[PDB]
C-alpha cells in the first residue's frame, strides 16, 4: 500500500521521456522542423515555441487515452488478495495504451523485435514467430515502442517529402531564369525567398496541415 | 463441405493451444496451456477415444507435465517444474496425506517424499500443485 | 524396433526422445544444451545407455523420483554442514526411507558427528542443505 506510492512517484519521474518516445509528439515535432527547413529559414520561427504548438496538439489528441488511466487507477479496490490477480490488474489497466501502440505501429517492424529478443533470451534454438500471431497474442510493452518510434519517423518523413516538393520546383526555375540571362554570379536564394513565402501563405498550409494531422488520428462528427 | 467419412481432428501447423482445446470436448474439462508450452507446434491426423490415456503418452513424447485438480487440466512444459521442502512443527505427513486423499488432490504420479512420522518432506511437481501443497502446509500449523 | 536417428541435434531435442523409454521426463540445463550429437541410436537398455553417454559426453544426472535432471559437470557445487543435536545416522536413515539416497553421490563424514561434506548436482545439494538445517530448528 505504501510502496504503491513509490511506484507512483517513480512513474512520475520518468514521465517526459515517455512523452519523448511513446506518444505522437514525434510526428508533430519532425514535420514542424521540416517545414522550417524547406522554407530556408534557419532560426525563425524560434523552435522553442514550435515545441509548444506541437505539444498542444499531441496533448489534445492524447487526453482521452490518459484520462481513463486516472479513473481506472483511483479505484478504491486496486488492492486484491492474490499475487497473480494483482499483476493481472496492471495489465488490463495498461491495455488501453497498448492497443493504441498496436494500431499505429508497423507490422513487420514489431515482428522483428520478438525474434530478435528471443534468441538473446534462450538461444538460437527458439523457432521464429510469423504474422499469424496477430489474431490472439499480444507483444510486450518494451518490444513495441522502438518499432513504434521508427514507424512514426517513417511516416513523418513521408509527410515531409511531399511539401518539400513545391518549393524545389520554385528553386529550380529561379536558378534557370537567372541563367537565361547572364547573371551567373548571383545568389538565387535571395530572390527565391519571397516567392517561397508566398507559395505557403497564399496556400495557407498551416491551417489545413494542422487539421490534417488531427484527421490522421481522430474523426469529426 | 468437409468430406471425410470417420471422426478425428486434422492439425496443419497447430500451435498447442488450438490443439488441446479441440481435445477439450472429449475431455469434459477445460484445458489451460501455459505460455512457454504454447510455442511448440504439431501437425497430423489425430483421433480421441480415451484422452486421459492419450494425454499421458503425448506428454512424454512432446515433453510436458499435466495436472487435473477436479475442475480443469493444467499443462506446462518440462522446464517449469519446481521443488520445495517444508517443515511441520505439530502435524504428521501421514496426517497431511489423509487430507489430500480425502479431499481429492492426491496425485500418484507426483507423490510426497518424506519420512512417515515427521514434519519435513519434499514435494515437487507442476507449478499449480506445489504452491497449493506449500500453502496448505503453512496454513495448518498456524491453525493448530 | 525402436531408436532415434540423430542428425545434428542439441541435447534437449535428443534427451526428450528418450523420455518415453525412461518413464520420467528429462530436464536439461541451458549450459548443457549447447553440445550437439549425430548418429543412429537404439533405446533398448536406456538406464545403461544414459550412464555410458553421461561419461563419454561429460554430464551429471540425478533422478529424485519424478524427473531426471541433467546438468553439465562444471556446475557441481559442494558444501559442509554441521548438525547440533542430530547425528549423521538418522539423516541417512531419513534418506534411505525417503528415497532420496543416491549411491553415486553419498554423504562423506564421520559416522557419529555433526559435520559432514556433500557435493553433487545443484538440485541435490540444495535439497540436502535445506533438509539438514530444517531438522535442527525443529529440535
Amino acid at each position: 500500500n505504501d510502496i504503491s506510492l513509490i511506484a507512483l512517484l517513480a512513474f512520475s519521474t520518468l514521465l517526459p521521456f515517455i512523452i519523448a518516445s511513446g506518444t505522437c509528439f514525434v510526428k508533430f515535432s519532425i514535420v514542424f522542423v521540416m517545414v522550417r527547413n524547406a522554407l530556408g529559414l534557419q532560426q525563425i520561427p524560434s523552435n522553442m515555441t514550435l515545441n509548444g504548438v506541437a505539444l498542444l496538439l499531441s496533448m489534445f489528441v492524447m487526453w482521452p487515452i490518459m484520462h481513463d488511466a486516472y479513473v481506472y487507477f483511483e479505484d478504491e479496490d486496486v488492492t486484491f488478495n492474490d499475487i497473480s490477480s494483482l499483476s493481472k490488474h496492471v495489465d488490463e489497466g495498461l491495455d488501453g495504451y497498448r492497443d493504441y501502440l498496436i494500431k499505429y505501429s508497423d507490422r513487420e517492424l514489431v515482428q522483428f523485435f520478438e525474434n530478435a529478443q528471443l534468441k538473446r533470451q534462450y538461444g538460437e534454438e527458439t523457432e521464429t514467430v510469423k504474422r499469424d500471431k496477430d489474431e490472439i497474442e499480444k507483444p510486450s510493452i518494451f518490444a513495441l515502442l522502438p518499432a513504434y518510434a521508427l514507424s512514426e519517423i517513417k511516416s513523418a518523413f513521408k509527410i515531409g517529402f511531399y511539401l518539400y516538393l513545391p518549393f524545389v520546383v520554385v528553386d529550380l526555375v529561379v536558378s534557370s531564369v537567372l541563367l537565361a540571362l547572364g547573371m551567373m554570379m548571383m545568389s538565387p536564394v535571395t530572390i527565391s525567398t519571397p516567392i517561397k513565402l508566398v507559395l505557403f501563405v497564399a496556400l495557407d498550409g498551416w491551417t489545413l496541415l494542422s487539421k490534417g494531422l488531427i484527421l490522421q488520428y481522430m474523426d469529426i462528427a | 463441405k468437409i468430406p471425410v467419412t470417420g471422426s478425428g481432428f486434422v492439425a496443419k501447423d497447430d500451435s498447442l493451444r488450438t490443439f488441446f482445446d479441440a481435445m477439450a470436448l472429449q475431455l469434459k474439462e477445460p484445458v489451460i496451456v501455459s505460455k512457454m508450452a504454447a510455442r511448440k507446434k504439431i501437425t497430423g491426423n489425430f483421433e480421441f477415444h480415451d484422452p486421459n490415456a492419450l494425454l499421458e503418452k503425448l506428454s512424454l513424447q512432446l515433453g510436458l507435465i499435466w495436472y487435473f485438480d477436479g475442475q480443469a487440466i493444467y499443462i506446462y512444459d518440462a522446464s517449469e517444474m519446481r521443488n520445495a521442502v517444508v517443515s511441520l512443527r505439530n502435524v504428521s505427513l501421514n496426517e497431511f496425506n489423509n487430507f489430500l486423499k480425502r479431499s481429492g488432490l492426491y496425485n500418484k504420479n507426483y507423490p510426497l517424499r518424506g519420512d512417515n512420522r515427521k514434519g519435513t518432506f519434499y514435494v515437487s511437481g507442476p507449478p499449480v500443485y506445489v504452491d497449493m501443497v506449500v500453502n496448505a502446509a503453512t496454513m495448518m500449523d498456524k491453525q493448530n | 524396433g525402436s531408436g532415434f536417428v540423430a542428425k545434428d541435434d542439441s541435447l534437449r531435442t535428443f534427451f526428450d526422445a528418450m523420455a518415453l523409454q525412461l518413464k520420467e521426463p528429462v530436464i536439461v540445463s541451458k549450459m548443457a544444451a549447447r553440445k550437439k550429437i549425430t548418429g543412429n541410436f537404439e533405446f533398448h537398455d536406456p538406464n545403461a545407455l544414459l550412464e555410458k553417454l553421461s561419461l563419454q559426453l561429460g554430464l551429471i544426472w540425478y533422478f529424485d523420483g519424478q524427473a531426471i535432471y541433467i546438468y553439465d559437470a562444471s556446475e557441481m557445487r559442494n558444501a559442509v554442514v554441521s548438525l547440533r543435536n542430530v547425528s549423521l545416522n538418522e539423516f541417512n536413515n531419513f534418506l534411505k526411507r525417503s528415497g532420496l539416497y543416491n549411491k553415486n553421490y553419498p554423504l562423506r563424514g564421520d559416522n557419529r558427528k555433526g559435520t559432514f561434506y556433500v557435493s553433487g548436482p545443484p538440485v541435490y545439494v540444495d535439497m540436502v542443505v535445506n533438509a539438514a538445517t530444517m531438522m535442527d530448528k525443529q529440535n
Binding site: - | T43, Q61 | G3, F4, K7, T13
Partner: peptide, 28 residues
C-alpha cells in the same frame, strides 16, 4: 528420404520439422 530431419522410427514415429515442431505421419 526425410532429407535432413531427425526422426524416431518404428511403430510410433514422428518427424522433427524443427527443434519445436512435430509431425506424425505413417509409422516410420
Amino acid at each position: 528420404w526425410l532429407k535432413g530431419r531427425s526422426f524416431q522410427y518404428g511403430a510410433e514415429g514422428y518427424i522433427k520439422m524443427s527443434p519445436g515442431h512435430w509431425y506424425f505421419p505413417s509409422p516410420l
